[PDB]
Write a protein that binds this DNA or RNA. Sequence first.
RNA 1: AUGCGA
Lengths: 443, 69, 107, 106, 56, 65, 134, 286, 57, 167, 51, 57
Amino acid sequence: RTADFRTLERESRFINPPKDKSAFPLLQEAVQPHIGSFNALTEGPDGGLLNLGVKDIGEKVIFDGKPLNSNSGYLGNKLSVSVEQVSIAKPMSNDGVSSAVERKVYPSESRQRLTSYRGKLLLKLKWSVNNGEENLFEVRDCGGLPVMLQSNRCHLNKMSPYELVQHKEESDEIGGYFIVNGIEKLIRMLIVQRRNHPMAIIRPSFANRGASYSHYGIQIRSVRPDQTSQTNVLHYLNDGQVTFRFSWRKNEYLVPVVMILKALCHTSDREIFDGIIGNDVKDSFLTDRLELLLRGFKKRYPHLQNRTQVLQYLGDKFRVVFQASPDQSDLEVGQEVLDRIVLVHLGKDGSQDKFRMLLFMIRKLYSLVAGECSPDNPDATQHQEVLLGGFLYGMILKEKIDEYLQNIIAQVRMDINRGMAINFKDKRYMSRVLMRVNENIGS
Amino acid sequence: MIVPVRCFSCGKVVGDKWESYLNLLQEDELDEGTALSRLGLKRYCCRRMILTHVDLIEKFLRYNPLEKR
Amino acid sequence: LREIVMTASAAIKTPQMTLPIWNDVSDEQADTFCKSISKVLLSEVIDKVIVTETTAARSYVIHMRFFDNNEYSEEYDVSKEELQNVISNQFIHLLEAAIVKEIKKQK
Amino acid sequence: SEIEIESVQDQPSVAVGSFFKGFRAPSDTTFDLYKKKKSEKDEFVLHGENERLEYEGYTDSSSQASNQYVVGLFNPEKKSIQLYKAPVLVSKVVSKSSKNLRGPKI
Amino acid sequence: RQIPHIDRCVHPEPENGKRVLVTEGVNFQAMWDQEAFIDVDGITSNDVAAVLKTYG
Amino acid sequence: SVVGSLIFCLDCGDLLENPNAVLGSNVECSQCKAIYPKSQFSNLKVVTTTADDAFPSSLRAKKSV
Amino acid sequence: FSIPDGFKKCKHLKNFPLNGDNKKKAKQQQVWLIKFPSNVDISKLKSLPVDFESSTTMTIDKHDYKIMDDTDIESSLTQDNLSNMTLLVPSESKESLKIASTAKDNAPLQFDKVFSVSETAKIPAIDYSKVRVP
Amino acid sequence: VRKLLPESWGFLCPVHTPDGSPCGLLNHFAHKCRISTQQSDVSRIPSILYSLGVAPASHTFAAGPSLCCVQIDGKIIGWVSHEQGKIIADTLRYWKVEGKTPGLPIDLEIGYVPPSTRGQYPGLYLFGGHSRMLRPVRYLPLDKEDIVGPFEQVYMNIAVTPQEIQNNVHTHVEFTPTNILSILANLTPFSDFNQSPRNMYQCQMGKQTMGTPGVALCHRSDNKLYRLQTGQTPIVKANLYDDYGMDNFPNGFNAVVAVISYTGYDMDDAMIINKSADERGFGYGT
Amino acid sequence: SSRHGQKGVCSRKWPTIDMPFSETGIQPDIIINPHAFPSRMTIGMFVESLAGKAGAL
Amino acid sequence: LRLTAEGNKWRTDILKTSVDTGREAAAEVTNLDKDTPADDPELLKRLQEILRDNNKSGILDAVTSSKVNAITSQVVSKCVPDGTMKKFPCNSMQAMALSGAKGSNVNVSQIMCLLGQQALEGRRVPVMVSGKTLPSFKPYETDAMAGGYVKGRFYSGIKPQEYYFHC
Amino acid sequence: KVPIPGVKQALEKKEGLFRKHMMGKRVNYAARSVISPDPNIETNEIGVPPV
Amino acid sequence: YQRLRHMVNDKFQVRSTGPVNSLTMQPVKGRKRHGGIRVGEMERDALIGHGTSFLLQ
RNA sequence: AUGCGA
Ligand SMILES: [Zn+2]
Ligand SMILES: [Zn+2]
């Protein structure tokens, strides 16, 4: 009597399956990290991860070259396109189109038919004209997004075993996978750097970036509420210079860290010094490297005298690449860059908090350089977290809606660059443009 | 799938002894050992045949596509 | 085996040369010779280096506090006179060249 | 051995201000106090100006709401403290040179 | 003190053969001056190229 | 303020141009306008040292146990 | 300026008897800074066990507390004025705050003692005899 | 990268690993591991920390390896002494296992990193966000469950069983050491009696085993299925065989085995079956 | 394969008459060579044999 | 596979001696006086100095390894052929290794005596940066087991802390 | 972006038409099968299944 | 005991005649294509080792 | 090409 057979209990469960709660709650809890992950893209805080993502993509502005005959360099042609909400519907199929009675579509059907198990993806498009002169809402259907089984978007999410058997399913079907063309696929979980925490790494690639690079460096993987990531690296140059690495359009970019410091918040050099060394006034090692950093920045850019000028230099120097154009001034492009690159885990208006953390990363980097602390291990489980398949889903969706809006803007650019036949105000134009880009993101 | 007809190792027909064995575990509140002793499965090849069985057919049969549900 | 057969590399990773020592060669003589051939870097004898940079030229007072004379004399079989010759001839010339190189780095 | 408390003053009077290491300001520099009577508590704001710069300081409301600063003056001989609630204000100093900008584009 | 190409001379325990000293570097010409302790006729090395250049 | 070999503007906290390089007997801040090469002049010195790592050796190993 | 309309001007201040019992370097007076969780009502105190020097544990509404006192951070016996924890002294309800001092030396003053009220916690010991059953 | 690290204890299985190229790359979560899918109560944590003696980062004005940095999700909220670092970490763990601090979710991960000579850089890095790997262990001071993540575990003394609890050292104990094994590794009986790589080849065989894939097979249309009809429940099993219900999907059969070289066809890796047994349907599959 | 990762192909389908029979009147289902265990150290399989035998009886 | 009551008596009695071996070697490589307390603060600081150095840690591993391997050699040489519950012929497990049909005296000692010291890339168990080789081990544990020496055997099983090292 | 290979790519690398179809080839009159033991055949023979 | 899905017994294949790739006229690939097993480079080396040059041809 | 059997 230690592992006794559950014989009558089992055979009873085989003959008369549970009608209220599956047994073996570990069996459902084992795939909980998948299903739960997919539920967080449709329900949760604010509206779920996906609605935060579309709230973070913001706007895509385009100016029809508002002729008007400031009206010749201020155009007077603003078109702000965005996405307010994103809705996902449970699988349905209506035949002959509309004029039919709709039926719920079950996984058994997708498997028997050897087809995907799609849910209609809808997203509330916002067509804002002249910054507010005219607002247009449109719910656009973006094709069938494959829904995860037993998730908050599959009909089997809440079915009792008895109902599950009544729907031709494995009385215990865990789910968490996708029926795509009838083939069951799951998204493999991945081990990625632990978010939001500076990891001190010595890497010979860091020396491989070029001259004056040391091995030492800091890597923080900032992840936004919507779970999209942005890796930020600090490098200690052999010269004492510290450079800040980031990646945009999967291209890498280096900026002096003292620039992102003077750019985040208005401060004195003595405020950065106190931020870094503090009470530690006795580190000749750190006092001198920091004198090289601050004095060196004062050397390169003697005319960046205040934070605003610095912001203008960053927006002005990246305006060609952040695709924000005349639609923004170099101050706006600069601040939008800061908010979009530097420690995005701290969020908008976290620029003092981003300042404090960035100084903490510089200090950690000098503690690594001196050798007063050990380096961390990227491959230790200590320093790692798990990218859940559903989260990859939300990130790739966010990117697809960003591209979809980029495609609208491209379509307006082509139409206006070959005809300029019609104004941003026409509802006809909304239907026409929307009908000329491809919106089947489900496919 | 379904209670085997015979014990693989020995050869004694066992397929007749399933339902009574299950009755003996329910109705008589017996224990699996004594139930198998009263069934005459006095060898472990036989003992294990019925003792370990998993009559999965009851789970299969609820999937019968030839009747409305 | 790859380092030999595959590449015939003229740069072994661990190049060694075996030296047979005469039957007459004492074990103590052998340890003396082992010290006598091994390289001794200047770093290997330095205990502490204090640089007091004062700046109205930019003054660098470089203080090299070595081990005890007998300490490096019993680990590396070298004298204070050899330290004089090496510092006064080699070390300074190389550091002064590196400082000039750092001026080029400045400009 | 414990120090006794003599008096407590609960209404705004004295303030405390964080600055750069070296702040000294003119022999006459003046500090404007503000009181944004917001619901339960009054988040404060300090503002001053000088011949070149202007210094503005404010409270970290999310840390202010979870911790509150008190300053008192003790006499060893009278064993008495005059207690004063004082806001700690993280102040930044902008100059006249810090108020110039470039064109809105290249 | 540096003999070109030679780093360290160590005193490993003798085994299955004559007493020897194993150096961590290869420089025959330099051991040629040390003949009063080393039977030069019995020098050997793991460096094939250096042997080819010196001993043929 | 002077720290180590850095001297910050006393009024504005800017790391003002080093007194050693001014073209006057009195420099000023690039943020404010304070007088310094003229006032107190500093005697900038740092006792810099080795990290007690650059110099591995058997003798250091005999100093570590 | 008088910005964020959500703010009001000041109208009520109180004189600071900085010198009614001060004497230049002769009165050993002190000013202290103490950090108080909002959960405590300072006005409901009567004395302060700051005199405990280090063992400044304190009990406020049957709650047990520890008062951390530190010299560091701003009273270091190392540098001249290691603090940016400026004292801003008023004068009248119709005057703006002033930099603390003890005479007209354009020199800021520090807090003689800095204290911090820290919330204590039960942290009960492990019952080894109950847990380590074989 | 493939080296099995001790950090993975309780999070990744030490035996659920493929054999070949992927070895060490394709880990498997422990049967008791969880993944955070939300984030909570980060907003109330600053208030309690401030009450516990954390100096506000605007007010602290100090930074260094000489001081503990309290951070929440990579938001530096304050600074304290390393001593107060440890007092905060432990009293915080007490308020976590207690039920009196609703701004403090049980599943918060409290990363304490003590001061260490050339060690990991000190601090009190709390984490509450998603994708954290979290596992239950039994907290002894309240004899109640506590969720620990892989970051804090490194510096935590978790006794493996109650009788090995060392005085004044282990602050938690495993609920069961099976919590460090994956599902299939627990399904393997007496897995602690075999050479490790034989247990790993056991995971690959049982994982490659022809069994019962489902029971709705008349309503699937796989390119291939292998379904054993004569399936049985092991006499010898882990209790997780019942707790995970694997008896719903039996993958084998109980055979009378003689460990005997006798026939001359059982060498190295080859085994003999009874003919009459196969004729009676033994291991019969479709 | 057993639950011990000791996999083997069936070399032959031995006649029941040719199998060895115990004094209990049975002939085994499977015969595994003993010399496989000394390299693998699959002694968990030995214990599973003696536990399944006890538990069947 | 069984030993006698005698063979288990010798096996357990010899295996009682590794408890000194762990710290005794830790204080040899640390270069501190004999019987130095397992909780001397200087011992812990010296051992952290060793942890931060890969070479010094290599010396500590190699010396602890040689000593506990000397305990293994003792255990097998005492038990094994003399202490088995049934001998030679009467013992097929010994027969296969000794004839060399299959197995080795190493395998036979791993079943009947002890597993012994696990190694990786040529040395003892990895240690976390906290100074711990497993969560259950206090930082810098000088116990031989904490380095990965498994006293348990396949015939009587291995403790879970030991299963993680043999894994 | 995945440009159709030319004759230089067709001839070289792992394949090298020379390596994949010249230095080694598929062959006729050949079979592949899982091997099974048998002590009753000669040590110089191979038991061929009647297929 | 568990039955592995890999009945590699069934994976046997023999080809004495079949299709050939048009670019080589050599046996096509794959069991299901009735393709022919590869005599690889190492098997070529081995046949040269044996002196079996008429077998290698 | 991915996974995988030997
Ligand atoms: Zn039978
Ligand atoms: Zn200035």
